[PDB]
Symmetry: D2
Subunit: 102 residues, 4 copies
């Protein structure tokens, strides 16, 4: 619904599957794992998702480790003010980029 | 210098000048560690020293919100926040590079064995 | 079908709508404009899209100009060997990133 | 130096060392212009001179394919290819920064008025 996360792997050129994503609000707010498409839907509802400051934390360290690759970061963490959001994240072992589509 | 940060601005085509950078450390058991502002080349040298930079989990937070607001631009992110374990197999030098846009950032690390 | 392009704007946090995308093969091969979602489907067919070397050129200069913003690049150009492809591009006035999902 | 290129490797956490960079120029009417390889810091200074770097449309191509293949990694892109108009309102200095991964790259420009 109102909040979606999508994660891609820049080394293998694939979606990042079964990655843990935790969302906090300024406080745990929503969480899940990415699908076979790298996407995570169903995180929250329009009633629950009010304006405020949110942190999306993607567990990139566990992802790389599962592949046998040593990663730099503990996570990709993404902190923004909410005022239809997709958080996109593009992962490499020593880098990440992230954007918001609103 | 064991921890350097370099920040560029994708909207202006320039270094990101005078952007605040805060570093925190999480101990084996989330403490302020060091902070500074980027120079006219967008670089921040002198945050810390070999003697102070111990093993741990470090968070580097770049104050993107203040930077964009001071330029008259609408920032999405509160800050850009790079979290990594440092020095776990021995002392290393770390450069944290960040490229900023109002609704996106990218960051990478360069790690060298002194 | 086999080739899709998606374009996002990192300054406004929106899809990049009505952007011209030209695809070449090593020679014009396919082209179109992005939709309201920043997406361009229907570029080619599975019969047409053989293994080879392709260039996706996104007309980022015309996009920024339409918004009243002076851009650095003439285009975002993306050259790869084909051997289900999404080319994703994330645009700012002086920067772009691009990835492939295969 | 009016045209500098800096390249980092997102897989290894290092500069991208000894990567070939070719520059071409399109005239008012797609000519080789200059070329070099990145240093041990991932930087390429000395591509050109004030006197040679005229107005025009320039293409900087970074040979990502050779670089990844030499490291035993599967590259998607043939090369990373930055195309821009230069010097149109007067001489400027340009830094082209690129961050490489096997299936992705990002690039930005820093533009300064000497
Ligand atoms: C976040 C990001 N960085 N560089 C690029 C390219 C992207 C990107 C662009 C377009 C669609 C996407 C979907 C998921 C993940 N990332 C993306
Ligand atoms: C972190 C990052 N994302 N996309 C690119 C391009 C860079 C980059 C590459 C090379 C040198 C740099 C120096 C400072 C900041 N960023 C960079
Ligand atoms: Ca909940
Ligand atoms: Ca200063
Ligand atoms: Ca240790
Ligand atoms: Ca065709
Ligand atoms: Ca050298
Ligand atoms: Ca002119």
């Amino acid at each position: 619904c109102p909040l979606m996360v999508k994660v891609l792997d820049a080394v293998r050129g694939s979606p990042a599957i079964n990655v843990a994503v935790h969302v906090f609000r300024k406080e745990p707010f929503a969480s899940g794992k990415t699908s076979e498409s790298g996407e995570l839907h169903g995180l929250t509802t329009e009633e629950e998702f009010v304006e405020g400051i949110y942190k999306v934390e993607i567990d990139t360290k566990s992802y790389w480790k599962a592949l046998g690759i040593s990663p730099f970061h503990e996570h990709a963490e993404v902190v923004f003010t909410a005022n239809r959001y997709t958080i996109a994240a593009l992962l490499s072992p020593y880098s990440y980029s992230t954007t918001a589509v609103v």
